[PDB]
Amino acid sequence: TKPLWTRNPSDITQEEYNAFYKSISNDWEDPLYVKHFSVEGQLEFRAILFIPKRAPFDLFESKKKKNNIKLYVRRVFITDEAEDLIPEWLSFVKGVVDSEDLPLNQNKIMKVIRKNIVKKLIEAFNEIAEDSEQFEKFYSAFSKNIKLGVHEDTQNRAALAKLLRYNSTKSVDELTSLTDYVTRMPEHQKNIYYITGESLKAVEKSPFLDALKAKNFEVLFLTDPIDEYAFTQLKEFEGKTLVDITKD
């Protein structure tokens, strides 16, 4: 009879998290991942956040951001329609946030909660990334929210960019991360090369690939306008510069 989130992650089992998830998500499936944590220091609060196995329908209105994360303050419900609690590109997250001090009434306290949540969720994505198979599932569902985050989040960009995934000349069937791309780059390669296009088919046989394939340089394939734009906002990854081959 004690709020699940107030319990230590160690004492909670799956199915307990699953049932609790069903209880708040209007979803029948178990969550893809569960991020239960607590924050201490200047501000104190607990939270259980979930990443759905699949992107919800959300085809009722024009907008979308209707984050139904239940907001509690010392175990007493307050609202499931909080504002600025979590970024718009992350609205797909479901769960509960229980704060010790009143989120008040913009408010400052709310901002530090939002900051910790973003930090924890990136932490959850890198975790899902440990299983390239379960990560594909997550990418198929929220690759759009990730790209959106890389575009909206300048302070967490580099980190989020580590979540992008693309096909390449050396990554045909399976997708690859920009980190693995870097690792694969030969000693004399200084740039991360890529090419933009309407589709994979249209980009796979570009004559611009010849000057690279012959020098055994891997090249990424971007087919989404958001990925393209994102790359100009990223510029560099891990130190390497992003270069569009079609240009030069």
Ligand SMILES: [Mg+2]
């Ligand atoms: Mg089950």
